[PDB]
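Fold this complex.
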Amino acid sequence: YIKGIAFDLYGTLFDVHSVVGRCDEAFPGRGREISALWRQKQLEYTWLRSLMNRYVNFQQATEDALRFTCRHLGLDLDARTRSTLCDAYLRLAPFSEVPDSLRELKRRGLKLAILSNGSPQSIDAVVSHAGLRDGFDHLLSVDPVQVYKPDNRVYELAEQALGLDRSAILFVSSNAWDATGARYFGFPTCWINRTGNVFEEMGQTPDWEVTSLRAVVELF
Amino acid sequence: YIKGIAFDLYGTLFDVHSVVGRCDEAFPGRGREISALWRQKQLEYTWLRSLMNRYVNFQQATEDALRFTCRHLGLDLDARTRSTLCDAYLRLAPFSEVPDSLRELKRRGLKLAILSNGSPQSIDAVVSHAGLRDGFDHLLSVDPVQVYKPDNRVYELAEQALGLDRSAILFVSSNAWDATGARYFGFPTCWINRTGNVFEEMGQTPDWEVTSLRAVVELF
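Structure:
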């Protein structure tokens, strides 16, 4: 049935927790608090700006979300500390299974794509950094449609770039809110649950719940 | 310039913290954790469901947000405990200044309205409960437009029900994310900052920042 796979980037293939280290060495002890508030602010800004029809690229939203987090925690964030800390995302590390799981996936002749909210500038940066560029067929950014997920205009891009119907495209995501929208759109959905989280209560259920990409490779 | 005022309900005129008590007497010690996660889940569900174009009334979203919160904290939430705890919102208490501030406001002949996300069922319940029904001209729900804030289709309702241009309507809100959307829409905005929070980093700034409704009454 499936001939392609649309992956999320942050949290699904690459660990966001990689930022904590660089956040802590700038604001000692506070490094874990700055990141937890950073990611929630990012997500909330992309969703709200979309609803307000006031779009700005992901790089902009990530910078604004940090500026708020630091100001909210009373932390003093100068210009330079803002750049290197935002530069941290462009160097995330993939979860241990990812590299080998992707390799065996492509070996089965399936089309692999990344449907991420990050700018095409960011997407290529983290993927190439991990040396995983030679593994994906398409690196899809939401920038063109000028709106963020879970807006359906985003999910279509994946259906158009892969040249396959949504029914032949497996949607893989760690974020249960994205897997809810994708399922509504029509994609068969696989939720990656490494931390034993519970699904969102927005009326949907993923077709598959797994603990790592290892299980995705075994679905074939 | 201003001839009318559009108020938010939860957090602006009525205290959400009123729920903590009834939450704690059902799950002792955990009462403050269940509420903090409840409100964030409510907001996130209204925003996401809007973007997914999958609307359900506020009463539904408040019930789903609790079902998740409890399941996320491992708490066992039976049928009855879900009803009385959700019934808690229909009995919130207004901040001390609210009752008198609203009275002196109407005395100045300004039109007062509530533009809330809650169902018209909820809005009238909490307002009448506090005996504040005789103080508002219109009780606007988002239910008709089938979408939640900060979507502009919501802000228009206020401009249409009051029969005034957005420039003659003061938008009062405690939630800085709502005051950002309203300002974009065109309303003069007053942010109620009682907890000394910092504004969102979504490109906007309210026209007025105050600590209570007392300052709003003095703007006239």
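Residues 31-51 of chain B form the longest helix (21 residues).
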